[PDB]
Structure 1
Amino acid sequence: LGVSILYRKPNGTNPSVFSFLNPLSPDIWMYVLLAYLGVSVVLFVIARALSTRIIGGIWWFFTLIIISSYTANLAAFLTVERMESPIDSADDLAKQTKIEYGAVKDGATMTFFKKSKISTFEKMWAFMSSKPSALVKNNEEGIQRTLTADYALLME
């Protein structure tokens, strides 16, 4: 065998319906509402025709702006939602600094990679020794360090 890395994926998810309306702020839907209420009462005033037609065409033009704007906001979410990129390798950790990681502290993993002398990997050892208060040792230790905190793991 060897040693690999474990972590959780995609904390938080969203099914229907909340994942659909979401780029549009809720009071603006109510502005669509009161706009429709402005639309829906003109005909009884008419009972009390290019005149309303130019108003309807400007409404037409306006709601084109409305739909174009919202669809713009949708596709603007989608593309960055596909511009997303996760990481996998240890070289990712060799470049980054933010994410915590560790092995069986004072174990055969820890002392073995203390004796492992790839400059990248003993540099990672120097990293792990460099933040000593982050170190846990046992199994449930790493489980609680991972389930709660941003912490990769180096285990049998």
Structure 2
Amino acid sequence: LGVSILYRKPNGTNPSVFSFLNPLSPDIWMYVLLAYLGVSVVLFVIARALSTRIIGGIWWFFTLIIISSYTANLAAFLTVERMESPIDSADDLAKQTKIEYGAVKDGATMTFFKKSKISTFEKMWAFMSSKPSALVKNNEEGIQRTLTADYALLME
């Protein structure tokens, strides 16, 4: 058989409703409602058509900016959110900094990767030599490290 890699599922996902206007600063809306009630009170400012057309054009341009800007922030979030490798293969582990990876104390996988002299596997072993706690007593300790720490394991 071959050595394989197990990992955990974070899956920290929460959709609408509350995920909706988070790119927009939620305190812009009180400043929105100030001008909103100011436009609603125009019915009494004039009471007790250039002067209204200037309001229409200014507010027209003004709200034309806002929807395009927030849509831009949305898609700017979306495309960068479409960039997940995340862990196709251990070459990421040859390039990452935070996900620990290793084998068993006196382990057969540890034995093989001391034997493994592929330079990328050599630097994975150099990682493992740099980590005092990448090696475990049993596979269950590796299960504990995967569940607790950001740990991938070179188990069967």
- TM-score bin, normalised by smaller chain: 0.7 to 0.9
Q: Judging changes above 3 Å, is the alpha-carbon distance between structure 1 residues 35 and 144 closer, same or farther for their aligned structure 2 residues?
A: farther
User: Where in structure 1 are there 5+ consecutive unaligned residues?
Assistant: none
- More off after superposition, 50-59 vs 127-136: 127-136
Q: How many residues align?
A: 156
Give the aligned partner of residue 100 of structure 2.
Answer: 100
Task: Give the distance between the partners of 1:123 and 1:79, measured in 2 at CA.
Answer: 33
2:7·2:152 contact (CA, 8 Å) conserved in 1? yes
Q: So what's the TM-score if we normalise by structure 2?
A: 0.85
Task: Give the distance between the partners of 1:50 and 1:11, measured in 2 at CA.
Answer: 56
1:103·1:137 contact (CA, 8 Å) conserved in 2? no
Answer 1 or 2: which has greater helix percent. Answer: 1
2:99·2:152 contact (CA, 8 Å) conserved in 1? yes
Q: CA deviation at 1:88?
A: 1.6
Task: Give the distance between the partners of 2:76 and 2:45, measured in 1 at CA.
Answer: 41
Q: 1:21-76 CA deviation, whole Å, 9 max, x = no partner?
A: 11101101222222211111110222323322211221111111111211111111
Task: Give the distance between the partners of 1:127 and 1:150, measured in 2 at CA.
Answer: 15
Q: Judging changes above 3 Å, is the alpha-carbon distance between structure 1 residues 53 and 120 closer, same or farther for their aligned structure 2 residues?
A: closer
User: Where in structure 2 are there 5+ consecutive unaligned residues?
Assistant: none
Q: So what's the TM-score if we normalise by structure 1?
A: 0.85
Task: Give the distance between the partners of 1:31 and 1:54, measured in 2 at CA.
Answer: 20
3-state SS of paired residue (1:92): coil
Q: CA deviation at 1:9?
A: 4.0
Q: CA deviation at 1:133?
A: 3.4
Q: CA RMSD in A?
A: 2.1
2:103·2:134 contact (CA, 8 Å) conserved in 1? no
Task: Give the distance between the partners of 1:100 and 1:33, measured in 2 at CA.
Answer: 50
Q: CA deviation at 1:92?
A: 2.4
Q: Percent identity?
A: 100
Q: 1:63-101 CA deviation, whole Å, 9 max, x = no partner?
A: 111112111111111121123432322222223343210
3-state SS of paired residue (1:78): helix
Q: CA deviation at 1:10?
A: 4.7
Give the aligned partner of residue 63 of structure 1.
Answer: 63
Q: Judging changes above 3 Å, is the alpha-carbon distance between structure 1 residues 153 and 18 closer, same or farther for their aligned structure 2 residues?
A: same
